[PDB]
Design a binder for these strands. Structure first.
Length: 437
RNA sequence: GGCCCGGGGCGGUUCGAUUCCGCCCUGGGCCACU
């Protein structure tokens, strides 16, 4: 409980055992043969090609190199023919461009078509940049593969390992650039403790500077930020995590935390103690990939949060959860109920025109003067957070994300109390309210 | 699909909106999947 001690024991969790290695090697062997019998020009890339893949994440990436002149359609058609002839089982997949995923001797394989080019310039799509990323990394990360694995294991165990929207963490590529930069997991963790939201790490220049945002420049393109999708808060969590690790090394930082399920009854009591209004907007999950849905859940969540603050319900925090079946937007407010009346600021007394206009409005309670200007008492259409949101969501469904909104437009409800504690959101609620133990 | 910058139109709210809440056209940049 020295560092060195823990890291040795940690390699145990991050490095693939001999069976997983062999299993992959054997598949690479077969995959090459099958590809050669067809005489296809390919190149293995990704963490597998560079022996940096984390334990239990064995997947082989094979990029097909096509002449700079082929049409985008040739690549897809030809790419599909090859993946389809070479894989034990396949399944077309999509993204920037379509490609084929599948299996071979029991291991996940991605057969991706891209253009074979020289010089990062003339890149038509991200998939074309991948080969250069691989070439830059292959000779430089050799020997530090386990350092990469410790870093990956660390991030994964703390819920910030991938760069996709459901996570907004650190991509695999980013991890390797960091190891290349600092030389090891420890040096990376030691220095990350000094990272700021203004830090800029330029790998190719072997330099660190102050910029306008956290930026890790791509060795293959200076203009690209490899950490582009690492959220501000996730950056912070990492920095904090490193400080804590160096202050008290523990194998715990590499072991996923137990969901720590709680009994709803206890949750009910805690919410009672807090005296807040806790509720959730429930609707049906649109049939879209997490990549389109999560940013939508974030938007919808925010727009409602903002509605809650300007409408003065004093929201504390918000959260959200997606199930196979529905999606939940969670909220906690300090105000369970507010009065019907509120005061509206009017014009300064000297402004006769607007004053006369301001008094023309027929109201229930007769305006008054205070510190030089007129004020009027007004009445709200709703006096509870749940009421406001029911109103907001029913009329502002369109500003809650193209799909999420369209779904809420056809059906939503607000849940609170016992009926809420029964939904698959109890874990998100504890996290949101800082429940501990 | 989401986010950033910019234009052309509107609706609602308000004493008063370019400036609050939103809606259509629309130009550029960027992010995630591969």
């Amino acid at each position: 409980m020295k560092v060195e001690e823990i890291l040795e024991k940690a390699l145990e969790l991050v490095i693939p055992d001999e069976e997983e290695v062999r299993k992959g090697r054997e598949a690479e062997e077969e995959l090459r043969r099958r590809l050669d019998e067809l005489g296809v020009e390919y190149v293995f890339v990704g963490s597998y090609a560079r022996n940096t893949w984390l334990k239990g994440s064995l997947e082989i990436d094979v990029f097909l190199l096509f002449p700079e002149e082929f049409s985008k359609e040739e690549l897809r058609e030809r790419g599909l023919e090859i993946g389809k002839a070479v894989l034990d089982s396949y399944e077309i997949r999509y993204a920037e461009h379509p490609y084929v995923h599948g299996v071979v001797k029991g291991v996940e394989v991605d057969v991706v078509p891209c253009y074979k080019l020289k010089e990062p310039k003339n890149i038509k799509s991200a998939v074309d940049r991948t080969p250069f990323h691989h070439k830059w990394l292959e000779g430089r990360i050799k020997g530090k593969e386990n350092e990469v694995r410790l870093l990956k294991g660390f991030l994964k165990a703390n819920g910030i390992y991938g760069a996709e929207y459901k996570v907004r963490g650190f991509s695999g590529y980013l991890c390797e650039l960091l190891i290349v930069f600092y030389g090891s997991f420890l040096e990376t963790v030691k220095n990350a403790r000094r990272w700021t939201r203004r830090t800029v790490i330029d790998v190719a220049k072997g330099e660190v500077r102050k910029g306008e945002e956290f930026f890790v420049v791509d060795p293959v393109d200076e203009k690209r930020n490899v950490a582009a999708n690492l959220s501000l808060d996730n950056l912070a969590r990492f920095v904090h995590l490193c400080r804590e690790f160096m202050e008290a090394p523990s194998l715990g930082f590499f072991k996923p935390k137990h969901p720590l399920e709680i009994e709803p009854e206890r949750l009910r009591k805690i919410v009672e103690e807090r005296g807040t209004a806790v509720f959730a907007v429930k609707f049906r999950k649109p049939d879209i990939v997490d990549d389109n849905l999560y940013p939508q859940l974030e938007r919808a969540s925010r727009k409602i949060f903002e509605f809650l603050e300007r409408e003065n319900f004093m929201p504390l925090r918000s959260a959200f959860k997606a199930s196979e079946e529905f999606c939940y937007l969670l909220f906690e407010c300090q105000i369970k109920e507010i009065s019907r009346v509120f005061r509206r600021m009017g014009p300064q007394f000297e402004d006769e025109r607007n004053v006369k206009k301001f008094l023309s409005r027929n109201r229930a309670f007769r305006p008054f003067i205070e510190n030089g200007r007129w004020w009027a008492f007004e009445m709200r259409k709703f006096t509870t957070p749940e009421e406001g949101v029911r109103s907001y969501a029913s009329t502002h469904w369109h500003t809650l994300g193209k799909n999420v909104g369209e779904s809420i437009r056809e059906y939503f409800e607000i849940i609170s109390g016992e009926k809420l504690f029964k939904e698959p959101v109890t874990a998100e609620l504890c996290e949101m309210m800082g429940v501990k133990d």
